[PDB]
Enzyme design. Structure first.
Site, PDB file in Angstrom:
ATOM      1  N   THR A   1       0.844  -1.158  -0.022  1.00 26.97           N
ATOM      2  CA  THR A   1      -0.081  -0.044  -0.045  1.00 26.97           C
ATOM      3  C   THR A   1       0.829   1.259   0.140  1.00 26.97           C
ATOM      4  O   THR A   1       0.390   2.166  -0.754  1.00 26.97           O
ATOM      5  CB  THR A   1      -1.016   0.085   1.268  1.00 26.97           C
ATOM      6  OG1 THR A   1      -1.744  -1.297   1.100  1.00 26.97           O
ATOM      7  CG2 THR A   1      -1.775   1.296   1.221  1.00 26.97           C
TER       8      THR A   1
ATOM      9  N   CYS B   1      -2.482  -6.692  13.342  1.00 32.41           N
ATOM     10  CA  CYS B   1      -3.587  -6.285  14.241  1.00 32.41           C
ATOM     11  C   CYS B   1      -4.587  -7.390  14.106  1.00 32.41           C
ATOM     12  O   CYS B   1      -5.514  -6.951  14.933  1.00 32.41           O
ATOM     13  CB  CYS B   1      -4.042  -4.951  13.240  1.00 32.41           C
ATOM     14  SG  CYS B   1      -4.880  -5.383  11.574  1.00 32.41           S
TER      15      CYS B   1
ATOM     16  N   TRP C   1      -3.977  -0.778   4.984  1.00 33.46           N
ATOM     17  CA  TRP C   1      -4.188   0.347   5.322  1.00 33.46           C
ATOM     18  C   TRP C   1      -4.843   0.938   4.494  1.00 33.46           C
ATOM     19  O   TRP C   1      -5.167   0.618   3.408  1.00 33.46           O
ATOM     20  CB  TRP C   1      -2.719   1.230   5.124  1.00 33.46           C
ATOM     21  CG  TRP C   1      -1.769   0.798   6.359  1.00 33.46           C
ATOM     22  CD1 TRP C   1      -2.042   0.069   7.365  1.00 33.46           C
ATOM     23  CD2 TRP C   1      -0.242   1.321   6.425  1.00 33.46           C
ATOM     24  NE1 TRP C   1      -0.687   0.025   8.141  1.00 33.46           N
ATOM     25  CE2 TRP C   1       0.369   0.793   7.362  1.00 33.46           C
ATOM     26  CE3 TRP C   1       0.428   2.362   5.431  1.00 33.46           C
ATOM     27  CZ2 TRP C   1       1.617   1.053   7.802  1.00 33.46           C
ATOM     28  CZ3 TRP C   1       1.823   2.286   5.663  1.00 33.46           C
ATOM     29  CH2 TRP C   1       2.402   1.643   6.934  1.00 33.46           C
TER      30      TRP C   1
HETATM   31  N1  LIG Z   1       7.130 -12.073  10.779  1.00 34.68           N
HETATM   32  C1  LIG Z   1       6.801 -11.173  10.029  1.00 34.68           C
HETATM   33  N2  LIG Z   1       7.410 -10.577   9.143  1.00 34.68           N
HETATM   34  C2  LIG Z   1       6.923  -9.576   8.151  1.00 34.68           C
HETATM   35  N3  LIG Z   1       5.500  -9.623   8.015  1.00 34.68           N
HETATM   36  C3  LIG Z   1       4.760 -10.276   9.069  1.00 34.68           C
HETATM   37  C4  LIG Z   1       5.310 -11.204   9.745  1.00 34.68           C
HETATM   38  N4  LIG Z   1       4.137 -11.713  10.491  1.00 34.68           N
HETATM   39  C5  LIG Z   1       2.985 -11.297   9.939  1.00 34.68           C
HETATM   40  N5  LIG Z   1       3.441 -10.362   8.867  1.00 34.68           N
HETATM   41  C6  LIG Z   1       2.473  -9.609   8.081  1.00 34.68           C
HETATM   42  O1  LIG Z   1       2.357  -8.411   8.555  1.00 34.68           O
HETATM   43  C7  LIG Z   1       1.070  -7.882   8.180  1.00 34.68           C
HETATM   44  C8  LIG Z   1       0.354  -6.959   9.245  1.00 34.68           C
HETATM   45  S1  LIG Z   1      -1.063  -6.119   8.646  1.00 34.68           S
HETATM   46  C9  LIG Z   1      -0.257  -5.271   7.000  1.00 34.68           C
HETATM   47  C10 LIG Z   1      -0.841  -4.071   6.577  1.00 34.68           C
HETATM   48  C11 LIG Z   1      -0.260  -3.290   5.387  1.00 34.68           C
HETATM   49  N6  LIG Z   1       0.304  -2.061   5.804  1.00 34.68           N
HETATM   50  C12 LIG Z   1      -1.055  -3.487   4.098  1.00 34.68           C
HETATM   51  O2  LIG Z   1      -1.403  -2.630   3.542  1.00 34.68           O
HETATM   52  O3  LIG Z   1      -1.325  -4.477   3.918  1.00 34.68           O
HETATM   53  C13 LIG Z   1       0.359  -8.960   7.514  1.00 34.68           C
HETATM   54  O4  LIG Z   1       0.068  -9.136   6.315  1.00 34.68           O
HETATM   55  C14 LIG Z   1       1.246 -10.228   7.782  1.00 34.68           C
HETATM   56  O5  LIG Z   1       1.086 -11.301   6.791  1.00 34.68           O
END
Ligand SMILES: Nc1ncnc2c1ncn2[C@@H]1O[C@H](CSCC[C@H](N)C(=O)O)[C@@H](O)[C@H]1O
Ligand SMILES: Nc1ncnc2c1ncn2[C@@H]1O[C@H](CSCC[C@H](N)C(=O)O)[C@@H](O)[C@H]1O
Ligand SMILES: [Zn+2]
Ligand SMILES: [Zn+2]
Ligand SMILES: [Zn+2]
EC number: 2.1.1.37
Lengths: 425, 279
Positions: A170, A235, A406
């Site tokens: 995003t 989240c 987001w």
């Molecule tokens: N150990 C890790 N390292 C990197 N990403 C991870 C993680 N564990 C979970 N995640 C990822 O972190 C994200 C949190 S929500 C991500 C929101 C992001 N700003 C967007 O626009 O999509 C999830 O997609 C999940 O897949």
């Protein structure tokens, strides 16, 4: 508080001198929505609990006291508030809750058409007070973020972004939409679907890293100086929408520190006055001591931004950071769709004007109750049309993928003054 | 052969479309810029109904099962200028593991087309232009093909989509559209190589996909299926055409798989521009 409100209605005690949530005498604040005082413990409870919603899409607890054992849900369309039986016994009278259950089309007191009742009256500038209430969080006092003077236009260079927990890219998408030249975009992510989404939509430009916990300070140094570090902790476990809430501090909290670490790894030294910017994102339905520890470690005051101002979703999120103009009010451009109906497909009509995502199935189509389609969920959050249709994945997964992301016009709002510091296309 | 109607006299085309699927016919007519007065369509699969609804913006008047369409229905829905259709091919095709029969189900439904064709046909002495198209697979029985040729009173044309598209799609087309025999031309927009239809970051060892080394793609030194949007690109459909409702990938691939090849259908439908009105 039953005896104390007995003395309140006898005109022997002011309702504004009592804490209408729990009946405490340690009144420090006023209740932001209704008439009465507010103690600090109830403020912490209100911070944690107000924007907590159950799986039915309605509030998890009473709106007044942020507790309550059995609650009254609201009949009015798009309203999700609940008022427990105990609160209604003081402010509307005894037995008014049991009588109010029997009123099949019932409206809650934030939605009542009269707007004036005997013991309970609604205070007039409550949305303004709701916005002020987060500015009222001066308990966690911190210094203002360091303002860096604008670089001249001819001297500007392409931005470099380290993006942790990138998801579906995003951030880079929004930077493109703003027309900022991107030198490079390093991204750590672990979910393969999100990796694929970013790969296709951003055309191989993204250099993919693995887990955030495998990124060392040496990695940070050898991948070139970064101009913008962004990220949002998981989240799903913090959100009350997931039925399996084993914990909140486990998993997600640990990963928060990963951001923290790499932020310090990516930060220029003192005496290096080159512009540097960072953004952390999280949900509003979180613990108070959790929020304090986050504010302590990032050494800043959160800004709550709700996407409803610019988009068709209720998406209230905290944004810590030092980007200029992170406090300024949100403007919605004509391209943005403030009504749910404009985001629907043709042939569909929305009873709802907003979708609450942090009457389960929001759509009446052909006199039938349906979920929003994946392309419409993209339209709600501001994503370009057919953004996540890249690989061959199930609908449940693809909805989940979109759900975490987001809100695009909010992120555009935040990222917009970076145009004054970096190069344009 | 019906003599060409003068340009000023031309009117919008009316189409009865049996076994419509994902409304490939109306889409192609739009791509050719022919004004469509109305587009009556019979179909039973809900996903395909939805695809047509969204992509063609409510214009399509949806009917139910073909076997519920009476001659009275055909008369009261106004004169038709073009009747099109293709019988179910999944049971005729050797790709489905459960080949219980070939004449059952699909053959019966063929006659439905046959019936409604006669219901939609103008009488002798009514010399108004009228056109029809039936489609079927090449992997079919000989006596089956003979009975089809006997009933539609015509000679099949086999058209293979490889000439204009990146799929091996050899299909029979019965009909009276002018120039149904003439050779297929591939415009520059059409993609004769599989690689041009792939997503970025992917490389195709194959130049054509055989659909009537299972997984056709080497991506990141790994063997993968074509993505749904690429299957659309192979058959000539507009980008992200079947992403309307919330359906599984297996179903959505299946939905795309049955469909007519878009540039072949453009090739067939193109001389109808000489008989009806333009946008
Ligand atoms: N150990 C890790 N390292 C990197 N990403 C991870 C993680 N564990 C979970 N995640 C990822 O972190 C994200 C949190 S929500 C991500 C929101 C992001 N700003 C967007 O626009 O999509 C999830 O997609 C999940 O897949
Ligand atoms: N009884 C029936 N009435 C109408 N359609 C039917 C039917 N039984 C099966 N079908 C449909 O007939 C179609 C045959 S293949 C359809 C190909 C079509 N030209 C396209 O472009 O998609 C299938 O989609 C199937 O759903
Ligand atoms: Zn209190
Ligand atoms: Zn309560
Ligand atoms: Zn209400």
């Amino acid at each position: 508080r039953e005896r104390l409100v007995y003395e309140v209605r006898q005109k022997c005690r002011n309702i504004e001198d009592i804490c209408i949530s729990c009946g405490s005498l340690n009144v420090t604040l006023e209740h932001p929505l209704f008439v009465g005082g507010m103690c600090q413990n109830c403020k912490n409870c209100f911070l944690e609990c107000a924007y907590q919603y159950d799986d039915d899409g309605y509030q998890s607890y009473c709106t007044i006291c942020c507790g309550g054992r059995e609650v009254l849900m609201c009949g009015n369309n798009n309203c999700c508030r609940c008022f427990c039986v105990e609160c209604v016994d003081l402010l509307v009278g005894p037995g008014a809750a049991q009588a109010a259950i029997k009123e099949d089309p019932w409206n809650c007191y934030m939605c009542g058409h009269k707007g004036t009742y005997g013991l309970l009256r609604r205070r007039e500038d409550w949305p303004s007070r709701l916005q002020m209430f987060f500015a009222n969080n001066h308990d966690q006092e911190f210094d203002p973020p360091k303002v860096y003077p604008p670089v001249p236009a001819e001297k500007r260079k392409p931005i470099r972004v380290l993006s942790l927990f990138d998801g579906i890219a995003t951030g880079l998408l929004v930077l493109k939409d703003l027309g900022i030249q991107v030198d490079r975009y390093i991204a750590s992510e672990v979910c393969e679907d999100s990796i694929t989404v970013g790969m296709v939509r951003h055309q191989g430009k993204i250099m993919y890293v693995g887990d955030v916990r495998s990124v060392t300070q040496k990695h940070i140094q050898e991948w070139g100086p970064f101009d913008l570090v962004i990220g949002g902790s998981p989240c799903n476990d913090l959100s009350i929408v997931n039925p399996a809430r084993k914990g909140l501090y486990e998993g997600t909290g640990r990963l928060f520190f990963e951001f923290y670490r790499l932020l310090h790894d990516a930060r220029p030294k003192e005496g290096d006055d080159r512009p540097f910017f960072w953004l952390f994102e999280n949900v509003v339905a979180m613990g108070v001591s959790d929020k304090r520890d986050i504010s302590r470690f990032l050494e800043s005051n959160p800004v709550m931004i709700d996407a409803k101002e610019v988009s068709a979703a209720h998406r209230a999120r905290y944004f810590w950071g030092n980007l200029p103009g992170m406090n300024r009010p949100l403007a919605s451009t004509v391209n943005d769709k403030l009504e749910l109906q404009e985001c629907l497909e043709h042939g569909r009509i929305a009873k709802f004007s907003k979708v609450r995502t942090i009457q389960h199935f929001p759509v009446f189509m052909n006199e039938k109750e349906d979920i929003l389609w994946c392309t419409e969920m993209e339209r709600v959050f501001g994503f370009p049309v057919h953004y996540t249709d890249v690989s061959n994945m199930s609908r449940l997964a693809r909805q989940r993928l979109l759900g975490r992301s987001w809100s695009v016009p909010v992120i555009r709002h935040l990222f917009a003054p970076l145009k004054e510091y970096f190069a344009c296309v």
